[PDB]
Each structure stands twice: as C-alpha cells, then as structure tokens.
C-alpha cells in the first residue's frame, strides 16, 4: 500500500550507499587508499594516481 | 655540479635518493632543462680525483 514513499526512502539510502561504495573503487589506480599511494610511490606518479 | 654516471636519474622532481635528499632537491613543479655530459677528460685523475 505504502510502496511509493518507501521507494523514495529506498532510492535515497541506496544512492548514498552507492556514493559511499564509490570510495572503494580503484578507478584504474593501484589502490583506493590515498595514504597507501602517498606511502608507496614518488610524487611524479603519485600525482597521477 | 658534478655527480656520478648512475646518479643522473636522481636529478629529477620527486626522486628519492641520497644527492636528491641531502645535496640538491628539485621542486615538484619544476620547469627547465637538465644538461648532463661526461667529464672524464677534465674531472678525473689516474690517482683519484
């Protein structure tokens, strides 16, 4: 009966979760953690990552 | 300045090395040209320069 309102809530949380999940994406880089990239590479390639 | 044959890679921005860290440091945003040429004829001696 109350599918529409719950759907809106369902979309909003899912969107935030997806955005949060996007922080765990390498995006074609060696790691998704900035601290690891700084701790492991020189600034010419760390800047690229 | 004068350096070794193998140390010419260390005269670059963002490099980890001994002469890079403790002798001559380049900034990350460096613009310009590095010129390197052999000086065995002038900067070397048989007894050790």
UniProtKB/Swiss-Prot annotation, chain B:
Attaches the virion to the cell membrane by interacting with host receptor, initiating the infection. The major receptor is host ACE2. When S2/S2' has been cleaved, binding to the receptor triggers direct fusion at the cell membrane. When S2/S2' has not been cleaved, binding to the receptor results in internalization of the virus by endocytosis using host TFRC and GRM2 and leading to fusion of the virion membrane with the host endosomal membrane. Alternatively, may use NRP1/NRP2 and integrin as entry receptors. The chain holds residues 400 to 448 of 1273 of the full protein. This is Spike protein S1. It comes from the Viruses. It comes from Severe acute respiratory syndrome coronavirus 2. Residues 4-6 are annotated as: Integrin-binding motif. The gene is S. Binds to host ACE2. RBD also interacts with the N-linked glycan on 'Asn-90' of ACE2. Cleavage of S generates a polybasic C-terminal sequence on S1 that binds to host Neuropilin-1 (NRP1) and Neuropilin-2 (NRP2) receptors. Interacts with host integrin alpha-5/beta-1 (ITGA5:ITGB1) and with ACE2 in complex with integrin alpha-5/beta-1 (ITGA5:ITGB1). May interact via cytoplasmic c-terminus with M protein. May interact (via N-terminus) with host bilirubin and biliverdin, thereby preventing antibody binding to the SARS-CoV-2 spike NTD via an allosteric mechanism.
């Amino acid at each position: 009966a109350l599918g529409k309102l719950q759907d809106v809530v369902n979309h909003n949380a899912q969107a935030l979760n997806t955005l949060v999940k996007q922080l765990s994406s390498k995006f074609g880089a060696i790691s998704s953690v900035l601290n690891d990239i700084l701790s492991r590479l020189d600034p010419p390639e760390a800047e690229v990552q | 300045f004068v350096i070794r044959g193998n140390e010419v890679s260390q005269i670059a921005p963002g490099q980890t090395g001994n002469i890079a860290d403790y002798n001559y440091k380049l900034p990350d945003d460096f613009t310009g040209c590095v010129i390197a040429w052999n000086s065995n004829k002038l900067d070397s001696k048989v007894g050790g320069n």
